[PDB]
Amino acid sequence: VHLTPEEKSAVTALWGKVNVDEVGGEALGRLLVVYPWTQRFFESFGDLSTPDAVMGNPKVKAHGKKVLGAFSDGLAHLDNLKGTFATLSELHCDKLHVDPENFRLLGNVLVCVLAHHFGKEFTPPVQAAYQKVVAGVANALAHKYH
Amino acid sequence: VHLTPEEKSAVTALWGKVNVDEVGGEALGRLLVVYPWTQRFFESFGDLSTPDAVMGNPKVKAHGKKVLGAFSDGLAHLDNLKGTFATLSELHCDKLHVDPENFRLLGNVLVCVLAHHFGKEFTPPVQAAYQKVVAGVANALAHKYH
Amino acid sequence: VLSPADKTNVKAAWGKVGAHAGEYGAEALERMFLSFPTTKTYFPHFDLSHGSAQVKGHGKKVADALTNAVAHVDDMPNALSALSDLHAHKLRVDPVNFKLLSHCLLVTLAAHLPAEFTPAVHASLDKFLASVSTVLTSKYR
Amino acid sequence: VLSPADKTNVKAAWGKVGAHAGEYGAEALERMFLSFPTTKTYFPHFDLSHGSAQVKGHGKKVADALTNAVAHVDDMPNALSALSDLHAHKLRVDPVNFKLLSHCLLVTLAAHLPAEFTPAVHASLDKFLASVSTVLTSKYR
Ligand code: HEM
Ligand code: HEM
Ligand code: HEM
Ligand code: HEM
């Protein structure tokens, strides 16, 4: 993290308009649809075979809410982006063995979902800051492959 | 890094048989040949157009020696793998703008070159430790994209 | 691969992108240059600035080549050939950059087309671009 | 793409790998399972242990499918089809794993064939495997 004072603000002033409950699951839904190998990990979940049945999965919307949760814990605790996630990193790496590049895919689709919802106010320099937050959050979860 | 006592030894007991002067350049040579976009960065160098003219480039063998050098600085200073490379990271990231995944390619071909030279004594668990060192060295150079 | 129906989501999503394709291809350069600064290496002769006529002029080119992939999609290899020799022989673009531009491009379809941009179409557009990049890197392989 | 002469380095390098192909395909599984443990997820029904008859039996399969790519190389799509539905529909292997197995496979050609394994052939073999993986992931795209 660095987040120049003028990046920090564009990021902070987006999130407060974010309907976490219904964005977290637009993202986790899009993840299983665009990158289907991720479905392997969610077979505890139900019917994931056609894109409608995912975006309308009460589970997929439930779990996603936990996920915008930990982006919230990151988006404003950026000082140790590493330390807020230690346990989750322990959960994703040496428990579920999710390869680190999925961590980038998820943050990337999150950005597509941030763009999809906010349209023109997701201006390029306001994107450029989110690619920094996301890349950081993704370097943090992956800290236990070392 | 972790390097369990029994990994640490297989790694340390390979390197001392390593002819640094002529391995560093087998690797940097193989890099420009198998992954040619890297050539963009070495146009200060000379003829790189056919694979023979690279493996016999006095420059390509010279520069590679600096590179097995910084693996040597890593292979036995593993405690801060981050700190031995700060300046080099500053050199590769925000000076030459080399994308971080080339850092993995280079360590990967280094392993192909370690295997090529030592044959059967490059047993799988003795490889498995080098993929840890290399991945670490590659996480370290890239520390300034954050 | 690029199924009968992915071929349909792309011919449609680009269908309503129409008139704007050139503004969009340039918005997505601006996004790539901003977010992933390691790509600026290749355009030292551009003003990588917001108003820049060069990036705005190049948006037209990237958008022209995307169109000539949307139409001829059942045969990308032949159509995109000279761009798959320019990027791969002449320029030597690191193929990881193609992933990034594909991503900014999607963040641009998203930010301008919310109703089209259904999850299935996000998949199709991604599958489309993943094929454009595969074509663009095929001298490499 | 897979030029007239890359097609020649692979038909030759595999040529002298002959009798051993099955031992080698199994050595490279062992290497992948060891070095990149995140791949063990897919073989919970294997003894991912060194002597394991399953990994040794599977080495034969991976090596059989590589051969049936070396021969028919001018047409990977058609030949590898049912493995490009097994891995991509049935199994859902993360395509980043294909890069890793390709790498262990090269560390195995290297460790057993030093004189063949000239820098040009390292390139060819890599280009070959990059096409096998591209075929193996093509339902995905
Ligand atoms: C920014 C990236 C990610 C964040 C912040 C995140 C966050 C979380 C959180 C908060 C949980 C639940 C924590 C708890 O139960 O208390 C979780 C669980 C899980 N995540 Fe992620 N995740 C991320 C990426 C991924 C990716 C890429 C995958 C790959 C498919 C994944 C797969 C899973 C699975 C399978 C679980 C199941 C939890 C369980 O054991 O019940 N996650 N994640
Ligand atoms: C393990 C990974 C790597 C290590 C340890 C390494 C090490 C080095 C060292 C020691 C130097 C010279 C330091 C000095 O001049 O005092 C250097 C220079 C350089 N490296 Fe790397 N390198 C690595 C990966 C890469 C990669 C992947 C590229 C991409 C092509 C690259 C491109 C360069 C270039 C172009 C220079 C020129 C130095 C100059 O400005 O004169 N390096 N590297
Ligand atoms: C969707 C993928 C892409 C498409 C369709 C595309 C298309 C094009 C086209 C049509 C041209 C000019 C054609 C001509 O003048 O004959 C071009 C030029 C160029 N492209 Fe791309 N491109 C893509 C991705 C990239 C990426 C990722 C880079 C990253 C460096 C890149 C770097 C360049 C450069 C440096 C030029 C030349 C600029 C100049 O010297 O005028 N392209 N591209
Ligand atoms: C060079 C690339 C690869 C080739 C040529 C290859 C080939 C094969 C073949 C021929 C089979 C069995 C065919 C049959 O029984 O009909 C198979 C099965 C399988 N492959 Fe691969 N494979 C490759 C890479 C991978 C990778 C990277 C993974 C990573 C998870 C993987 C996971 C599997 C699994 C899980 C099975 C089934 C094992 C079982 O249930 O018996 N393969 N592969």
Give DSSP secondary structure letters for A93-124.
TTTT---THHHHHHHHHHHHHHHHHHGGGS-H
Task: Read off the tokens for D102.
Answer: 């390709």
Q: In angstroms, rounded to a whole number, what is the distance separating the alpha carbons of residues B57 and B25?
A: 9
C-alpha torsion angle, residues C116, C118, C120, C123 (rounded to 10): 80
Q: In angstroms, rounded to a whole number, what is the distance separating the alpha carbons of residues D55 and D30?
A: 7
Residue A30 amino acid letter: R
List Cβ neighbours of C18 (8 Å cut-off, separation of 6 or more). Answer: none
Task: Read off the tokens for B130.
Answer: 């080098």
Per CB-CB distance under 8 Å, the chain A contacts of C32 are: none
List Cβ neighbours of C64 (8 Å cut-off, separation of 6 or more). Answer: C21, C22
Structural element, H or E, at residue B29: helix B20-34
Task: Read off the tokens for D78.
Answer: 């058609």
Name the residue facing C92 among B40, B98, B99 (closest C-beta): B40
Ligand 4 pocket, mutate which of D87, D125, D126, D135 (most atoms under 8 A from CB): D87
Q: In angstroms, rounded to a whole number, what is the distance separating the alpha carbons of residues A128 and C104?
A: 10
Instruction: Judge contact between A61 and A19, C-beta under 8 A.
Output: no
- How far CA B15 is from CA of B9, B72, B76, D110, in Å, comes to 10, 8, 10, 18
Ligand 3 pocket, mutate which of C39, C42, C85, C94 (most atoms under 8 A from CB): C42
Q: In angstroms, rounded to a whole number, what is the distance separating the alpha carbons of residues D32 and D48?
A: 10
Residue D67 amino acid letter: T
- How far CA C129 is from CA of A107, A144, C73, C95, in Å, comes to 19, 32, 11, 13
**Residue C77 phi, psi (nearest 5):** -40, -55
Residue C129: closest CA among C55, C73, C84 = C73
Q: In angstroms, rounded to a whole number, what is the distance separating the alpha carbons of residues C55 and C27?
A: 9
Query: How many other CB atoms sit within 10 Å of the CB of residue C134?
Result: 19
Q: In angstroms, rounded to a whole number, what is the distance separating the alpha carbons of residues C126 and C48?
A: 26
Task: Read off the tokens for D58.
Answer: 């599977």
Please name the residue that has the structure tokens 């030093």: D114
DSSP assignment string, chain C? ---TTHHHHHHHHTTTTGGGHHHHHHHHHHHHHHH-GGGGGG-TTS--STT-HHHHHHHHHHHHHHHHHHTTGGGHHHHTTTHHHIIIIII---THHHHHHHHHHHHHHHHH-TTT--HHHHHHHHHHHHHHHHHHTTTT-
Q: In angstroms, rounded to a whole number, what is the distance separating the alpha carbons of residues D52 and D31?
A: 13
Nearest ligand 1 atom, CA A138? 1
- The residue count for chain C: 141
Per CB-CB distance under 8 Å, the chain C contacts of A111 are: 103, 107
Q: In angstroms, rounded to a whole number, what is the distance separating the alpha carbons of residues A60 and B23?
A: 51
Residue D84: closest CA among D28, D21, D133, D127 = D133
Residue D106: closest CA among B77, B34, C27 = B34
Quote the minimal CA–CA distance from B101 to chain A in Å. 12
Q: In angstroms, rounded to a whole number, what is the distance separating the alpha carbons of residues C135 and C98?
A: 11
Q: In angstroms, rounded to a whole number, what is the distance separating the alpha carbons of residues C49 and C59?
A: 13
Q: In angstroms, rounded to a whole number, what is the distance separating the alpha carbons of residues C68 and C132?
A: 11
Q: In angstroms, rounded to a whole number, what is the distance separating the alpha carbons of residues B100 and A130?
A: 19
Residue A27: closest CA among A103, A139, A128, A123 = A103
Please name the residue that has the structure tokens 């034969």: D60
Give resolution in angstroms. 2.7
Write down all domains in chain C, each with its CATH number in brackets. Answer: 1-141 (1.10.490.10)
Instruction: Judge contact between A104 and A138, C-beta under 8 A.
Output: yes
Instruction: Judge contact between C25 and C62, C-beta under 8 A.
Output: yes
Alpha helix stretches (DSSP H) within C36-80: 53-70, 76-79
Instruction: Judge contact between C59 and C22, C-beta under 8 A.
Output: yes
The single-letter DSSP state of residue C49 is S
Q: In angstroms, rounded to a whole number, what is the distance separating the alpha carbons of residues C3 and C11?
A: 12
Q: In angstroms, rounded to a whole number, what is the distance separating the alpha carbons of residues B29 and B20?
A: 14
Name the residue facing D110 among B34, B112, B128 (closest C-beta): B112
A16: region left, alpha or beta (phi > 0 left; psi from -120 to 50 alpha): alpha
The single-letter DSSP state of residue B41 is G
- Domain assignment of residue A47, given as a range: 1-146
CATH number for B125: 1.10.490.10
**Rg of chain B taking only CA atoms, in angstroms:** 15
DSSP 3-state of C111: helix
Query: How many other CB atoms sit within 10 Å of the CB of residue C49?
Result: 11
Q: In angstroms, rounded to a whole number, what is the distance separating the alpha carbons of residues D115 and A21?
A: 60
Q: Count up the domains in chain A and report the number.
A: 1
Residue D101: closest CA among D133, D134, D71 = D133
Q: In angstroms, rounded to a whole number, what is the distance separating the alpha carbons of residues B59 and C31?
A: 37
The single-letter DSSP state of residue D141 is -
Instruction: Judge contact between C40 and C33, C-beta under 8 A.
Output: yes
- Please calculate the CA angle C107-D137-B129 and round it to the nearest 5 degrees: 95
